[PDB]
Amino acid sequence: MAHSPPGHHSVTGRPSVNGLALAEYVIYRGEQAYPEYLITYQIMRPE
Amino acid sequence: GTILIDLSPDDKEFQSVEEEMQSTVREHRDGGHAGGIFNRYNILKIQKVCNKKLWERYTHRRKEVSEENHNHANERMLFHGSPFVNAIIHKGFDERHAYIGGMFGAGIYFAENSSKSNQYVYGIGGGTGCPVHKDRSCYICHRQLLFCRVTLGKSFLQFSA
Numbered sequence: 001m002a003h004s005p006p007g008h009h010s011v012t013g014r015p016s017v018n019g020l021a022l023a024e025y026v027i028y029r030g031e032q033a034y035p036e037y038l039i040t041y042q043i044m045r046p047e
Numbered sequence: 048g049t050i051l052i053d054l055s056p057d058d059k060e061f062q063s064v065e066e067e068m069q070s071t072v073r074e075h076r077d078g079g080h081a082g083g084i085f086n087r088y089n090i091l092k093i094q095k096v097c098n099k100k101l102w103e104r105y106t107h108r109r110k111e112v113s114e115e116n117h118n119h120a121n122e123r124m125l126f127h128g129s130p131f132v133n134a135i136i137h138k139g140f141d142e143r144h145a146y147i148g149g150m151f152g153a154g155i156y157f158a159e160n161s162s163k164s165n166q167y168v169y170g171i172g173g174g175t176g177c178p179v180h181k182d183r184s185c186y187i188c189h190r191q192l193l194f195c196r197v198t199l200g201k202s203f204l205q206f207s208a
């Protein structure tokens with residue numbers, strides 16, 4: 001596992017082409033996230 | 048140490064998590080290749096993940112980050128899709144859940160778009176799809192995502208395609 005950039009705790013990937021995309025984020029220590037909800041689902045075939 | 052508590056669909060907390068799932072679906076530039084073709088989900092179950100040791104491990108680190116960033120943890124709720132969700136809920140996030148080849152280096156990746164995390168449920172690029180039908184767009188097989196509390200603290204802003 002890499003490290004955060006110096007002076008930072010995470011990385012934000014800001015979308016710069018696809019206007020509809022929301023952000024993605026990266027942390028470099030497992031202790032920086034807690035898996036709070038387990039969601040069980042199916043994707044739905046569009047009509 | 049982990050116990051899973053089922054939320055009732057009548058519970059406001061089920062409803063607000065479902066709404067975050069559904070409302071952050073978008074189309075993907077792969078036309079559905081990795082994650083399937085869909086505009087919404089059928090939510091089958093929402094469980095609260097309770098583990099005292101993992102939670103305390105999280106809040107300890109959250110305070111350290113906060114104290115390094117003017118008392119601001121910069122905490123978000125974000126999605127995570129992984130073939131390893133069962134290990135994660137029992138043992139926590141660690142180096143074995145890192146995306147070694149990811150665009151921001153070897154770390155653990157999360158998304159605001161539920162549909163982005165859905166692309167990773169069966170592996171990177173959707174792997175070979177569902178284990179039973181080998182379909183990345185399976186409409187039958189049950190999938191699982193995590194909706195996670197994440198401390199970002201001071202986040203490095205990467206502008207990116």
Ligand SMILES: COC(=O)c1ccc(-c2cc(=O)c3ccccc3o2)cc1
Nearest residue numbers: 024127128129144146156157158164167
């Ligand atoms: C083989 O590497 C993995 O174990 C692994 C698991 C999950 C992911 C994953 C999970 C995500 O939810 C995700 C969200 C935004 C951007 C990238 C993302 O990638 C990546 C790699």
Ligand SMILES: [Zn+2]
Nearest residue numbers: 177180185188
């Ligand atoms: Zn299937």
